[PDB]
Write an enzyme that holds these catalytic residues in place. Sequence first.
Site, PDB file in Angstrom:
ATOM      1  N   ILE A   1      -6.538   5.445  -6.249  1.00 26.38           N
ATOM      2  CA  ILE A   1      -7.285   6.685  -6.322  1.00 26.38           C
ATOM      3  C   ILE A   1      -8.373   6.674  -7.365  1.00 26.38           C
ATOM      4  CG2 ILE A   1      -5.336   7.997  -5.501  1.00 26.38           C
ATOM      5  CD1 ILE A   1      -4.794   8.909  -8.261  1.00 26.38           C
TER       6      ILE A   1
ATOM      7  N   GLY B   1     -10.562   3.385 -14.365  1.00 30.57           N
ATOM      8  CA  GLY B   1     -11.217   3.739 -15.610  1.00 30.57           C
ATOM      9  C   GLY B   1     -11.577   2.501 -16.412  1.00 30.57           C
ATOM     10  N   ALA B   2     -11.321   2.559 -17.715  1.00 27.86           N
ATOM     11  CA  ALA B   2     -11.615   1.453 -18.624  1.00 27.86           C
ATOM     12  C   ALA B   2     -10.341   0.728 -19.057  1.00 27.86           C
ATOM     13  CB  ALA B   2     -12.360   1.979 -19.850  1.00 27.86           C
TER      14      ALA B   2
ATOM     15  N   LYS C   1      -0.724   4.614 -13.222  1.00 26.32           N
ATOM     16  CA  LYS C   1      -1.797   3.912 -13.914  1.00 26.32           C
ATOM     17  C   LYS C   1      -1.249   2.607 -14.511  1.00 26.32           C
ATOM     18  CE  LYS C   1      -5.042   5.511 -17.193  1.00 26.32           C
ATOM     19  NZ  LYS C   1      -5.257   6.529 -18.268  1.00 26.32           N
TER      20      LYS C   1
ATOM     21  N   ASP D   1     -13.916  13.731 -27.271  1.00 28.00           N
ATOM     22  CA  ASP D   1     -14.488  12.923 -26.210  1.00 28.00           C
ATOM     23  C   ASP D   1     -14.120  13.434 -24.829  1.00 28.00           C
ATOM     24  OD1 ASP D   1     -16.148  10.569 -25.546  1.00 28.00           O
ATOM     25  OD2 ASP D   1     -14.296   9.754 -24.705  1.00 28.00           O
TER      26      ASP D   1
HETATM   27  C1  LIG Z   1      -8.588   6.554 -15.290  1.00 27.49           C
HETATM   28  N1  LIG Z   1      -8.349   7.354 -14.076  1.00 27.49           N
HETATM   29  C2  LIG Z   1      -7.150   8.190 -14.193  1.00 27.49           C
HETATM   30  N2  LIG Z   1      -6.357   8.042 -15.318  1.00 27.49           N
HETATM   31  C3  LIG Z   1      -5.206   8.800 -15.411  1.00 27.49           C
HETATM   32  C4  LIG Z   1      -4.783   9.722 -14.449  1.00 27.49           C
HETATM   33  C5  LIG Z   1      -5.613   9.837 -13.337  1.00 27.49           C
HETATM   34  C6  LIG Z   1      -5.274  10.799 -12.267  1.00 27.49           C
HETATM   35  C7  LIG Z   1      -4.175  11.663 -12.160  1.00 27.49           C
HETATM   36  N3  LIG Z   1      -4.193  12.418 -11.004  1.00 27.49           N
HETATM   37  C8  LIG Z   1      -5.276  12.044 -10.381  1.00 27.49           C
HETATM   38  C9  LIG Z   1      -5.834  12.477  -9.124  1.00 27.49           C
HETATM   39  C10 LIG Z   1      -7.007  11.926  -8.676  1.00 27.49           C
HETATM   40  C11 LIG Z   1      -7.728  10.898  -9.446  1.00 27.49           C
HETATM   41  C12 LIG Z   1      -7.207  10.486 -10.628  1.00 27.49           C
HETATM   42  N4  LIG Z   1      -5.994  11.047 -11.103  1.00 27.49           N
HETATM   43  N5  LIG Z   1      -6.786   9.095 -13.176  1.00 27.49           N
HETATM   44  C13 LIG Z   1      -9.589   8.009 -13.547  1.00 27.49           C
HETATM   45  C14 LIG Z   1     -10.005   9.347 -14.213  1.00 27.49           C
HETATM   46  C15 LIG Z   1     -11.298   9.915 -13.588  1.00 27.49           C
HETATM   47  C16 LIG Z   1     -11.148  10.161 -12.074  1.00 27.49           C
HETATM   48  C17 LIG Z   1     -10.685   8.902 -11.328  1.00 27.49           C
HETATM   49  C18 LIG Z   1      -9.462   8.220 -12.002  1.00 27.49           C
END
Ligand SMILES: CN(c1nccc(-c2cnc3ccccn23)n1)C1CCCCC1
Length: 346
Positions: free
Chosen positions: A26, A29-30, A49, A145
């Site tokens: 879905i 990130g970094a 994650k 941030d």
């Molecule tokens: C680093 N990513 C991230 N880290 C931790 C949790 C989540 C998270 C939890 N629920 C959802 C639903 C849709 C997309 C992402 N998420 N996403 C990105 C953050 C920016 C959007 C894409 C994933």
Amino acid sequence: DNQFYSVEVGDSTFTVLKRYQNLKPIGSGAQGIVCAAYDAVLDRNVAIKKLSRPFQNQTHAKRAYRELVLMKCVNHKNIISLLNVFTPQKTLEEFQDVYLVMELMDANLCQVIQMELDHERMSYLLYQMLCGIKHLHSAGIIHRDLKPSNIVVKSDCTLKILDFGLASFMMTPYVVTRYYRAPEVILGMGYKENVDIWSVGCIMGEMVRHKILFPGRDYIDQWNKVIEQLGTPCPEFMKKLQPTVRNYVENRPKYAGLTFPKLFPDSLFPADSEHNKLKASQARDLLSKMLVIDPAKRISVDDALQHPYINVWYDPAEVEAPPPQLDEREHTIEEWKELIYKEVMN
Ligand SMILES: CN(c1nccc(-c2cnc3ccccn23)n1)C1CCCCC1
């Protein structure tokens, strides 16, 4: 009869517990890739994650350890909930990755921004953003941030924050966002609670204008955009800047600064209703207070919550929730491994 299994997601290999089935990437990130999934045990969908080798460097280690810790102690409705944490490796020597399993939201704030929102939804979102930042502050945490990506929302419009901010070399292929950082951060000045209000104002402005307020290749450009719009900050502010920085900003071409009804005209606000015309003025008002360069002249989190545009969602049961070592250290990649590993498995 292994407790785990493996599947290729995109390019990397996710090795997760059996309870988590049908993984779907879905996001990314970094510090890792994130997949959605179904947890047969809890009978619901969740987001996983993968923290691949979080101890490979202090930047990643510090971030990981910190997030892992705070995500387990902090408990708020507007701060993403940690469901389960695990590692497919059996010992400290084999240890390599850390899987963070959390509740699954529906989308990113970057996606919400790309759409027109009614005053009801826009205000409710900002309320949750502040409700949480409220808790984080009471927990002695100051993000510094906050950005659209690190904030996630559901369809019912509920909002939650993902990380807990800063506390730094990164030999990587991808950049970092600085657009929503406060001037005291862009210029280094020492901050306080309301340093996050600046981030919220940068988002609320983008939720309206639909375009990144202060974009820029470097902090040089970013600060330019700050003044080109808001104007050059009053002389009372410059006497708080590092002499070397002060000499840089002061000797910068001045600006009178555009007024707010100019920056955020009515064309961006749906005011066809007598009720909409009002809310639009209120929204434009909270903006003129959040997007203030001088921290001493910027509206606090508590006031923004008493603002007529926000307070219409107040509730002593939500905002008023009880807050909980000193994780700001310096170790080696082999120590960080030990620290993070033992933190994973209590
Ligand atoms: C680093 N990513 C991230 N880290 C931790 C949790 C989540 C998270 C939890 N629920 C959802 C639903 C849709 C997309 C992402 N998420 N996403 C990105 C953050 C920016 C959007 C894409 C994933």
